[PDB]
Each structure stands twice: as structure tokens, then as C-alpha cells.
Structure 1
Amino acid sequence: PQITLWKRPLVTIKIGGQLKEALLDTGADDTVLEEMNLPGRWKPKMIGGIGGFIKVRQYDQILIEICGHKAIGTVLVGPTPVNIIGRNLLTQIGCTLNF
């Protein structure tokens, strides 16, 4: 589909057997989701935003379905105010900016 930017581009995602709302974020290198208890191994990581850095848990080869489009990649989990779908997954669903 096509998504205008009058409002935040929020969509439904499916991850780890749960439905959530997440922000399609072309300004994000990585995908960062709100605290959730995903199974399997993880590694500590630090990611920076405009205000500084936060600690997150890095999970690899995680499946996320974004508006019916599936993507598999690295997902970071930590105290973020919003679920962020970043370019590592947006590329996999064929997402482009157009003007």
C-alpha cells in the first residue's frame, strides 16, 4: 500500500506470536521494540538517539510480519517509547520513499 505522513506511520506487526503497533521509520538503522520477553539467546547492545544512548537486548533472525509482509532480521528490545521498524527490515518488505 501507500502511507501518507500527516500522522505517524503506525502499522500492525506480528512478532513472537503477538500483535503490536509499530512505527515505519526510515530514519532508523535498526528495529527497536518495547520491552518483551522473546525466547532464545541475545547479546547486550547500546543504541543512540537524539538524546543519548539506551541499553537494549539484540536478538538475531527474528521474524516480523509488517502489514502482511514478512521480514527476518535483528531486533533490539529495550525501554523505547515506541516500537520502531528500521531500515534493516523495511528493505525486506520493498519499502520506498516517494515524492
Structure 2
Amino acid sequence: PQITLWKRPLVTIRIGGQLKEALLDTGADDTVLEEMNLPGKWKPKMIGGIGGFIKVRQYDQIPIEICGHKAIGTVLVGPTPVNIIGRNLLTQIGCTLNF
């Protein structure tokens, strides 16, 4: 689709058979989801945003379907204010900015 920006670009994602709302976030390098359970081995990681650094759990090669487009990649789980889809997965689904 084409998505305009008068509203937050929130989309439904499917991950582990669960439906969540996430923000398409071109200013985020990474995809960061609020606390949830994901299976498999994870690595402790730290990431930085506008307010400083937080600790997250890094899961690799997690499938997410974003608006019906399939991605498989790195998902960080931790205290983000909202679920965000970052550039690592935006590139996989062919998302671009256009003006």
C-alpha cells in the first residue's frame, strides 16, 4: 500500500500466531517489541533512543508478517514505549519513503 502520515502509520503484524499493532518507524534501526514471550535462544543487547539506553533481548530469524508481507529477521524485545517496526524489516518488505 501507500501510507500517508497525517495519522500514525500503525499496522497489524502477525508473530508467533499472535496479532499485534506496530508502528512503521523509519527512524528506528531495529524492530523493537514490548515485553512478550518468544521461543529459542536470545542474546542480551543494549540499544539507545531519545531518552538513553535500555536492555533488550535479541531474537534472530523471527518471522513477522507485516500488512501481509513476510519478513524473517531480528526482533528486539524490551521496554519500548510502543511496538516499532524498524529499518531491518522495513527493507525486507520493500518499504520506501517517497516525496
Post-superposition offset of 1:65: 0.3
Q: Over residues 56-79 of structure 1, what are the superposed CA-to-partner deviations in whole Å (9 max), with x where a residue is unaligned?
A: 000000000000000000000011
- Structure 1 distance, partners of 2:7, 2:68, is 21
| SS class of match (2:23) | strand
CA distance in 2, matches of 1:31, 1:48: 13
- Offset from partner CA, 1:21-63 (integer Å, 9 cap, x none): 0000110100000100101100000010011011100000000
Partners of 2:10 and 2:95 in 1: how far apart?
A: 14
1:13 paired to 2:13: yes
The CA RMSD measured in Å over matched residues stands at: 0.5
Percentage identity across paired residues of the two chains: 97
Q: Secondary structure at the match of 1:6?
A: coil
Q: 1:6 & 1:56 partners in 2: Cα distance?
A: 31
Task: Tell me the SS of whatever aligns to 1:92.
Answer: coil
Q: What are structure 1's unaligned runs of at least 5 residues?
A: none
Q: Gapped runs of 5+ residues in structure 2?
A: none
Displacement of 1:7: 1.1
State the distance in 1 between where 2:89 and 2:4 align. 19
TM-score, with normalisation over the residues of structure 1?
A: 0.98
TM-score relative to the length of structure 2:
0.98
